[PDB]
Amino acid sequence: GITKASLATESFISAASFQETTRVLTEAAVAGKRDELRGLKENVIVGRLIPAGTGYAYHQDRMRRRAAG
Amino acid sequence: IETPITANFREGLNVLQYFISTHGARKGLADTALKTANSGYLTRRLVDVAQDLVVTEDDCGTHEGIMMTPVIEGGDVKEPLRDRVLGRVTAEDVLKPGTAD
Amino acid sequence: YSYTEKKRIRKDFGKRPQVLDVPYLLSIQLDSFQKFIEQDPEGQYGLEAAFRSVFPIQSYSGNSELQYVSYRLGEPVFDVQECQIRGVTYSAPLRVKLRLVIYEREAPEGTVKDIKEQEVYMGEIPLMTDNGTFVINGTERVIVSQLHRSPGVFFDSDKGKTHSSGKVLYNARIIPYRGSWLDFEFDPKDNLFVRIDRRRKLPATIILRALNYTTEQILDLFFEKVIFEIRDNKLQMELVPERLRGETASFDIEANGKVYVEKGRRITARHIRQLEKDDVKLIEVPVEYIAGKVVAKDYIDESTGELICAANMELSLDLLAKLSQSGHKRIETLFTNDLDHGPYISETLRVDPTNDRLSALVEIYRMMRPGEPPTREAAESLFENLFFSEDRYDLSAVGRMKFNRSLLREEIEGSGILSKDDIIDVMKKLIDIRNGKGEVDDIDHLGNRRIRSVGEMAENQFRVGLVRVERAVKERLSLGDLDTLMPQDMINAKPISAAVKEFFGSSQLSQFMDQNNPLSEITHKRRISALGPGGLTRERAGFEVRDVHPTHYGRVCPIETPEGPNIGLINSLSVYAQTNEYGFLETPYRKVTDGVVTDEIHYLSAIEEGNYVIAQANSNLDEEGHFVEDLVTCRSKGESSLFSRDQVDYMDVSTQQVVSVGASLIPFLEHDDANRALMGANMQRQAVPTLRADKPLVGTGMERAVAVDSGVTAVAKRGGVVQYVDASRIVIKVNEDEMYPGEAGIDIYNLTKYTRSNQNTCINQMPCVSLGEPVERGDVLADGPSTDLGELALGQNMRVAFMPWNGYNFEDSILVSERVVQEDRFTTIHIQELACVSRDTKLGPEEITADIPNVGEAALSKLDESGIVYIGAEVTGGDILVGKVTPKGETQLTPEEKLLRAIFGEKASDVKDSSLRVPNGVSGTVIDVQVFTRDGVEKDKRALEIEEMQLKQAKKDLSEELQILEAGLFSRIRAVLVAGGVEAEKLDKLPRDRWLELGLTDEEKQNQLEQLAEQYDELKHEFEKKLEAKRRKITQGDDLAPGVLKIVKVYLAVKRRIQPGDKMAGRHGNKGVISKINPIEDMPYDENGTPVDIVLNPLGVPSRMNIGQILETHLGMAAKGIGDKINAMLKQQQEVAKLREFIQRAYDLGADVRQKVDLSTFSDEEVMRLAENLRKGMPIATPVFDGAKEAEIKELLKLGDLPTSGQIRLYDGRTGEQFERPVTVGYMYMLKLNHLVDDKMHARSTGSYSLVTQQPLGGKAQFGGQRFGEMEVWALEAYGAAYTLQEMLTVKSDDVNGRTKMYKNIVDGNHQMEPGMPESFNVLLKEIRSLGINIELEDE
Amino acid sequence: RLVISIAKKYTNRGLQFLDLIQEGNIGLMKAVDKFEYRRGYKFSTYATWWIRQAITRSIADQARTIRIPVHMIETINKLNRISRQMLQEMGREPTPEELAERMLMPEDKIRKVLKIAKEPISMETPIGDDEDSHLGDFIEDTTLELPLDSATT
Amino acid sequence: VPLDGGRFATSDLNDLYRRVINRNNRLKRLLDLAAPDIIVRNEKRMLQEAVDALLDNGRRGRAITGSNKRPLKSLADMIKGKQGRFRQNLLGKRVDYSGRSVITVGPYLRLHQCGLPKKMALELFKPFIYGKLELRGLATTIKAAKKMVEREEAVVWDILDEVIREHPVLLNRAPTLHRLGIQAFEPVLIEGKAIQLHPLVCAAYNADFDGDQMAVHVPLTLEAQLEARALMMSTNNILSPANGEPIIVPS
DNA sequence: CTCGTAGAGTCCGTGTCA
Ligand SMILES: C[C@H](CCC(=O)NCCC[N+](C)(C)C[C@H](O)CS(=O)(=O)O)[C@H]1CC[C@H]2[C@@H]3[C@H](O)C[C@@H]4C[C@H](O)CC[C@]4(C)[C@H]3C[C@H](O)[C@]12C
Ligand SMILES: C[C@H](CCC(=O)NCCC[N+](C)(C)C[C@H](O)CS(=O)(=O)O)[C@H]1CC[C@H]2[C@@H]3[C@H](O)C[C@@H]4C[C@H](O)CC[C@]4(C)[C@H]3C[C@H](O)[C@]12C
Ligand SMILES: [Mg+2]
Secondary structure (H helix, E strand, O other): OHHHHHHOOOOHHHHHHHOOHHHHHHHHHHHOOOOOOOOHHHHHHHOOOOOOHHHHHHHHHHHHHOOOO | OOOOOOOOOOOOOOHHHHHHHHHHHHHHHHHHHHHHHHHHHHHHHHHHHOOOOOOOOOOOOOOOOOOOOOEOOOOOOOEOHHHHHOOOOOOOOOOOOOOOO | OOHHHHHOOOEEOOOOOOOOOOOOOOHHHHHHHHHHHOOOOOOOOOHHHHHHHHOOEOOOOOOEEEEEEEEEEOOOOOOHHHHHHHOOOOEEEEEEEEEEEEEOOOOOOOEEEEEEOOOEEEEEEEOOOOOOOEEOOOOEEEEOEEEEEOOEEEEEOOOOOOOOOOOOOOEEEEEOOEOOOEEEEOOOOOOOEEEEOOOOEEEOHHHHHHOOOOHHHHHHHHOOEEEEEEEOEEEEEEOOHHHHOOOOOOOOEEEOOEEEEOOOOOOOHHHHHHHHHHOOOEEOOOHHHHOOOEEOOOOEOOOOOOEOOOOOOEOOHHHHHHHHHHOOOEEEEEOOOOOOOOOHHHHHHHHOOOOOHHHHHHHHHHHHOOOOOOOHHHHHHHHHHHHOOOOOOEOOHHHHHHHHHHOOOOOOOOOOOOOHHHHHHHHHHHHHHHHOOOOOOOOOOHHHEEEEOHHHHHHHHHHHHHHHHHHHHHHHHHOOOOOOOOOOOOOOOHHHHHHHHHHHHOOOOEEEOOOOOHHHHHHHHOOEEOOOOOOOOOOOOOHHHHOOOHHHOOOEOOOOOOOOOOOOOOOOEOOOOEEOOOOOEEEEEEEEEOOEEEEEEEEEEHHHHOOOOEEOOOOOEEOOOEEOOOEEEEEOOOOEEEEEHHHOOEEEOOHHHHOOHHHHOOOOHHHEOHHHHHHHHHHHOOEOOOOOOOOOOEEOOHHHHHHHHOOOOEEOOOOEEEEEEEOOEEEEEEOOOOOOOOOOOOEEEEOOOOEEOOOOEEEOOEEOOOOOOEEOOOOEEEEOOOEEOOEEOOOEEEEEEEOOOOOOOOOOOEEEEHHHHHHOOOOEEEEEEEEEEEEEEOOEEOEOOOOOOOOOHHHHOOEOOOOEEOOOOEEOOOOEEEOOEEEOOOOOOOHHHHHHHHHHOOOOOOEEEOOEEOOOOOOEEEEEEEEEEOOOOOOOHHHHHHHHHHHHHHHHHHHHHHHHHHHHHHHHHHHHHOOOOOOOHHHHHOOHHHOOOOOOOOOHHHHHHHHHHHHHHHHHHHHHHHHHHHHHHHHOOOOOOOOEEEEEEEEEEEEEOOOOOOEEEEOOOOEEEEEEEEOHHHOOEEOOOOEOOEEEOOOHHHHOOEOHHHHHHHHHHHHHHHHHHHHHHHHOOOOHHHHHHHHHHHHHOOOOOOOOOOOOOOOOHHHHHHHHHHOOOOOEEOOOOOOOOHHHHHHHHHHOOOOOOOEEOEEOOOOOOEOOOOEEEEEEEEEEEOOOHHHHOEEEOOOOEEOOOOOEOOOOOOOOOOOOOHHHHHHHHHOOOHHHHHHHHOOOOOOHHHHHHHHHHHHHOOOOOOOOOOHHHHHHHHHHHHOOOOOOOOOO | OHHHHHHOOOOOOOOOHHHHHHHHHHHHHHHHHHOOOOOOOOHHHHHHHHHHHHHHHHHHHHOOOOOOOHHHHHHHHHHHHHHHHHHHHHOOOOOHHHHHHHOOOOOHHHHHHHHHOOOOEEOOOOOOOOOOOOOOOOOEOOOOOOHHHHHHO | OEOOOOOEEEOHHHHHHHHHHHHHHHHHHHHHHOOOHHHHHHHHHHHHHHHHHHHHOOOOOOOEOOOOOOEOOOHHHHHOOOOOOOHHHHOOOOOOOEEEEEEEOOOOOOOOEEEEEHHHHHHHHHHHHHHHHHHOOOOOOHHHHHHHHHHOOHHHHHHHHHHHOOOOEEEEOOOOOOHHHEEEEEEEEEOOOOEEOOHHHHHHHOOOOOOOEEEEEOOOOHHHHHHHHHHHEHHHOOEOOOOOOEOOOOO
């Protein structure tokens, strides 16, 4: 169900955005979980370019420069 | 209520008949003033789950597909084929009702 | 008719005769607070009640008590107006005489000392104004009456949700006025549990055990016993014949020789009848039948003492056999018929672990405060004070009345504390309903909902203050020594006044008086809220209470309620409604004597109303209260139907009684949908007073009632002749009949001129009457804001045409012709206040001088040397009003600027500018200035000038009044002196004071001259002392807030003209924005050449089923047609005859009308006056439901010589060609709403930011930007618009470094960006890192 | 229980009852360890003395957010007694001039003390009938250099 | 911060921290004094209570604030919940260069433009105006430009017209149900304080001319301008994103 | 087949939205 499905997202900032914040924060803290942001809502949160639409190319371009020599 | 309101707005209603319609309208107003909050919550959840979906690839190249028919709910064809299929990409070649077409 | 009535009569439609006229509309507030003050001996409602409740305060067993005498209301130190100006609370000091009495211990009983305190001061209490308001800090606040649930006992159902298997579980709630609540609820397994108000669930029987009741005593008090006697052998049952009713028999029931009930066939009614008439008493019974019964008492082995059967034990063969060999003849079982009499208390006893009283008190004590070691005495005192201590637990006279009514006991008045019988009866009723021989009550019945007005809540808060001080005084009276101190040091007044002023100031139900329209005031005072303390919260409830109950008929208005989130919890009070003696809601009805419908009225509450068959007002009555139809329409138990002529007990007082005043004003209500009625009423109450109010062409008759009842009009107290009229005061010469014997004199009314209303609107009173006009008691002297000739004129009536005009009225938008603004008929005046405060900074006090660094002399031109605007100067946005400078040094300027200072020699001014300049975009006249200096500081010259002006003005006014009253007094002395020998020829040439010194025959006449002489002297001396007092009030330094040196207040008067974007509405809920102002010629015009004023979109009528506005337009067109016809007939100056005949023919207009007009009045001139007033259009009056029929409109239109269909052919002003299909034109009364575009318009480029999160402030005073909410973020994401979102999210609001980068780039003409990190995200990082969680930005 | 009995006196000076009882326990222990039966002094008085000496000291120091000299607190107490007496006798209230009369202080310190006594308001106090914004939502940051001025510079 | 009027405003964390530090110092001294076990137990209990209220007040006895009965706000309260943070202040900001006002019809407009009040135009585009004023040299420096704008001379209107010519604006109505709740238009200067909206699109906005208000934002950077002009210009969205049918149908 | 243990269902109280 859409709430639970939302709950099972990879990024913990996404889950923290709208659910019981304490729950997700404690889970992520104990798990040592690592959020690469990878998504739309996180990118909004940090105030960088969305990977959607006009900004998709940017991130795609970044991907070639990212994780390379 | 068993007895209805016999008069209409061109003519004039009477005390009790008004009273009744008053109740009707009051309930209606509250109804809306709550359908707005519920619809807002629902749509927020919906956009929440569906945030990340972006068209990333040009063509996945699968042979899979779903069989679309005209929804003939019981008595008749409530919604035809054409509107349900307009603007969708095809999964495979369609034949006339007669093979090799 | 009265003289105000003769001035301008209003044509009335309406068929049924008003038996009762509308009462004084504000009665509730005034009379309730009157009851609150009300010095009375008998302890009834009144401060007295609170005192007698709390006092006498007895020492901690010290036998030195404090006793109460009486209270006295001090006279307010500050009159109303000055209290408003100076920002103080308008109040009276309260003084109380007390006696401290001290006994001796141990004395042969005798009070050693009684000493009386010199009227100790117990704080200040705000007083209510004549209109029913309170001035709390120089602002009028209103305390809206509050509806809430009455104390008592209520049985709720709570169906459905109980486990989703039905299980309709009832519960009894006992609610006190003051104290904890009791709740009895069931469980799935039918066990009765008690809970304390909002606590855990206890087994109910414990309370009965806590009441010191034994188990067997309990089951005795509840269940109906069955005796099993031993008669010659084996355990046979004594039988109640009806007892088996509806019970299958387990054995063969023969008795005394005859088989009655067959073995196996369930006992039928026939066999029961057999036994009943045969009178069979006793039956032998199989022991198996007994194997199922229950044991009532604890039958021990009485011979030896060993117990056999225990309390609440099932009966088994072994127990009965043990008893029979033991020899016990009488066994007492219970009657448990699972259908009627259920095992409820039995099952509680089975689950009941507690047995003794002590164990129950232990459980209570350890449950209420879990964990504290239970002490026997501690628990006993706890419980006793919980429910039987007079102080904590009091229901009421009301609570008790409802309680006893619910349990149907003849006694109305009971004891405050709950006697145990009460609880027992409550549980009896609960189990009775649980069996099904009783109905549950619905909370939403008005008979269960009580109205608490001001006086009661004030009394409660005062009670609380007293209980605080009482404990305090006990502390001081028990420990400290008794006999040295007098009884004023013991009690501290601070907390009492603290609590009362806290309530009056900071409460939800004490709100700003909505003061822009008289209707606004009247309806806001007559409001009923379910919110506040002791009441509901908006989130909890809940549709039950919002819906309209059939009980509201004629008591609360069904149609007026805010459409916002709080729908239903405001619900303004109906017109005729009153409060009962007990605080309930009651409405009048006309009595019905079987055949005749009499004129005696009785006020009924809801519960009594339920019983009778009441006929509706809309019933046809012939000449003596006889019904024309044998079959009439009534309602008795909330259901309407037809009943016969000889059954109706009462009848509606008048048709209007269903609706509130606001709704009562809307014409042709009968034809409008409820929704648009609601919106119409709400909007109509917000109309802003225009410059020239005129009158509604189509009213409802309430206009005069509201106008008089609002306090803004000036009304005559003693009728007479207008002696002097000036645009500030009306001086009236009393009629000799109405002259008080001792010192009647003349009456002087000072009017109020433009002062600022709560919403910044003007409230000005203009004189109505002219010199020499005779006035009667209760006549309307002066029209207040938005009032005409005594009538309510909220807005103005203009010529509208329904048609689409180049989509400029596309949606509900409205077109307006330049003609209206040309005549300036919708121009409002707004009086704004501005404040400059000079505080003390740590670098030094601020300064008010006019010397302001680097200011152009252009702006300073308009200030005097002191730095204050001249009264009457015209200012605009940006101009400087009051100069103010602040100390500021040690700038530590940047190097390059230092270089600049060295270069040019620019001595840096150590004072920054702070002057209070005019807000942007407002331009008007400054009408007045006020200056407040704290005591001690050196008054500036301008303050002295203002004090000189005020002094001289007050002196002038006092001399004015004294001289006018003295002239009247001397005139009366002359009027008496003509009796007993006329001497006025001698008199008129000798001085005036040589009229008292003259003599007359020693009689009552000379005594009356003596009276008038003594009154002359007394008026003189009072004049002198009040004058001196006024100068002392003027001079005294005013008390200012800590830290503020002085203050300058300025009242600005802005003239706001109607302009595009403003909101206008009709009374029927049609709304609109004025979209374009066109030249006169562009407007459509009729053949005759008169252009229309407004062009309204027709498409708004059919979809929004408010059709009444159309009939209104027709009838108004007819009225204005009459008006034009008479104006034409007047301009030709025909003759009295012609006008009189025509005006009579008009007033008659058919029949069935209750008007009853001339020819009685004076024959020529006053008719000319009436024509002069009516030439602007003859006013029609349809009451709400007994209104004007269509045919009557047609007929009146025919009288005007106008198309009967109400449509005219119209010519297009642009092209000149005619419109096809002629259109409806006519006058509608439209309103200008308070939403003025100039207030709403708002923009910011850059401005102030917030402290913690560097985001721009939200709001209007500080510039403030719009809130880009998440929904908009989603909107942006729907498009591929990433860059806009990015800038919006960081450079536009939160990134400081980025925002400055952006400003510089923009100014330089480059468009790039520098995203940075949003500050709020940094805040989040720091905040969670402040927690014990490590949050790091990784990198790869 | 003695500590509890004396503690209930100080019950409205911004201090969690339990902190009060704790300070009293510290004072009582101090008295006991310092108690002298051979010096000639009533034991109970000695104890209660130390109890108060500790409790009042703690409330004076750590009660207010901004710590304030104790003599200043005594000044406030005197002011409050005087205000109470004069107000309840006179009925109206004593004006700062009248207070300056009643005590010999030059009244400049009277209003200074009145200014100091004001407690800080909670930044979240909800604004009237609009429980959406608190007070914190209004306070503006004056530190910020104006962008105009940066461009000028 | 010291608010004007000698009184002070503080966050609740000040009180919470003060209380915790007090209890810490008291426990330190108690250990130095070797108090009996009961007292050290009580001190540790209270310290635990203070800490847990500090982290998350609301899972225990609700440590109220000084004399105000309102429970004081703990860290989690600042983070968690809608009213507090993440939801409230980080997707619900308050942008600059924005305006708001009442809407009015004004039928004569072209589909792709909207009537905008002058005075708002100056207020919004202040910095653009300054830039152009300084570029053409009509104003020696920025300060003189500011004075020249507050005088409101004809040259100011000329430059404002030239800047407004091709620059696009975003117009929004508060309940943005679907993506068409925010759309781009070219502004046309008009007198008065009311915003004029093209009628055909009111249906798309679900707007009514009965006192409904609309907000107006200005895209600043050049890329934003192009995004607006390409994707968000009214003329580009005639078909509903929900179903393919036209939205701008006559009403 | 019953005792001891295992499983399923339910209830209460808390957390969660406006
Ligand atoms: C004075 C009045 C008695 C009513 C009465 O019986 N009048 C006598 C009227 C009798 N008559 C004239 C109408 C003739 C009747 O026919 C005789 S009979 O009633 O039918 O026997 C009692 C009944 C309800 C009581 C109020 C409520 O508790 C709320 C509140 C409680 C506070 O703590 C104190 C204040 C409040 C406002 C109370 C005031 C006062 O205490 C009331 C009005
Ligand atoms: C009572 C007095 C009428 C006096 C009168 O009528 N005397 C008649 C005296 C007749 N006698 C006694 C001399 C005998 C004559 O012989 C009678 S006869 O002529 O022979 O028939 C009324 C009528 C007009 C009123 C004045 C106006 O407000 C303006 C005036 C200026 C102030 O800014 C406002 C108040 C002032 C002071 C008012 C004074 C006073 O309130 C006046 C005069
Ligand atoms: Mg609208």
